[PDB]
Structures are given as C-alpha cells and as structure tokens.
C-alpha cells in the first residue's frame, strides 16, 4: 500500500 510505504497510515490499524 502506497500510503503505508510513505508513512501516512499504519497497516496494523
């Protein structure tokens, strides 16, 4: 996920 890769979201929630 591009968002997670740029430190914008956290895929653990």
């Amino acid at each position, epitope marked *: *996920v591009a*968002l*997670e*890769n*740029q*430190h*914008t*979201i*956290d*895929l*653990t*929630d």
Partner: antibody
Amino acid sequence: VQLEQSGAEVKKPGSSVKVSCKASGPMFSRSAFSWVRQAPGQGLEWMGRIIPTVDLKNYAQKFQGRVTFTADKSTATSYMELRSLKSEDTAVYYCARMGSGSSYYGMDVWGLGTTVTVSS
Amino acid sequence: DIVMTQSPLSLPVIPGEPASISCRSSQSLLQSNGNNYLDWYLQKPGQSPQLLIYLGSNRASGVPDRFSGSGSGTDFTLTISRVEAEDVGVYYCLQARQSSVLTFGGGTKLEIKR
C-alpha cells in the same frame, strides 16, 4: 525477553534454515518485524520486514527470491526462512520490532539473535 | 536505491569530551509528513543493537540527553556531548524513507581514548 528467537543452527551449503521470533500477543498485532543479519566482524544488513497482521512482506533486493517470511497469528510467532545457503550466510540473524508506516519510530525492540553457521 | 555513508570508520575520544559522527544519504530522507527517516543505533560489545535516535533527532526512551541527533535531507550528525566508558561500541545510521526499504550505514566504532 520481549522477543524470543530459536536456537543456533548449523546447515550444509545449499540447504535451508528457518529462524523464529516470538512476541507477545499485543506486540505481534501492532508491529512490523525486521530481519537484520550480521556476518562475523561485519556490520548490520537489513534483509526485509513482515507485517504479520496484513501478511505483508518486503524483501531487500539482495535477498529477493531465496528468503521467505511467514507468520503464525495463533502463536504470535514470525519466521525467516533462508534457502540455498552459502558460506557468506554464516551470521547472527536478529529479529527487530517496529511500527508500520505512520507508526514507525525506529526498530525499538530487538531479539537476542540466532547464530546460523553454514558448513559442509 | 539509497546508499548510506557513515564517517569516520573509527573515532577515538578522550573521556568527558564530545564526539561527532556523520551519516550521508544518497537521497533526501525528508518525507511529506516533515520527518527525516534517519535513525541511529548502538551495538555494545556482545549485545544486540539498540535504538538510540529515531527519525533524525528523537531520543529513544532511557537514552541520556548527552546523545543528540541533528540534520535534515541528506546530511545527519550524532553528537555525544560528553563521551563516557559505557558508550563504547559501534554506532550505525539507518534510513527508512520508504517503510518497505531500510538500509544501514557502514558503522562507526567509538573508541574511548583512556
């Protein structure tokens, strides 16, 4: 010990090794886990990461194709499997916990390391 | 992708005096959220690495204030205001600009010049 790793291993060239890293339940569910190795007398080398909650894996280019990370959510344990072992793979393999994405604030919790020796 | 320089390779410092360690990235580490994704780690003899500074200038918990990280973009510096014997080990910088790609510098051995 917050992150428990499996014991030391010796394997023949060409075979495989699987190293485990067990965290607490709550730690496992909120974390990514990096694998960092250190050859004898050498520096640290990042091999990749797994985010167990979403079963997401990223591999360092140097290791793509012969490393696999897996995770068992029921035991809060993630695994590193390194295949087609070479002499150059003799190293200590560290598990390191970190936050995912916007929660990344460094690899703040480290395992003790697992010594893997490749020898005929 | 991104290459990390660390200098010097070894740094002898008289106890009580300051030390300065440099880390260089081939690409800016500054993200769109304003954070520089450069960490510093310390590996003491016989131990696992431990986090010292995260994201450029943030001290990890329990890290004394004589450790400080500075810099942005491509040039970063770890300063120990006053070195003491317990600080001996190898210091590594690390970039995490993309969450999916982490890269260590080559490391700097701190030598206490007793």
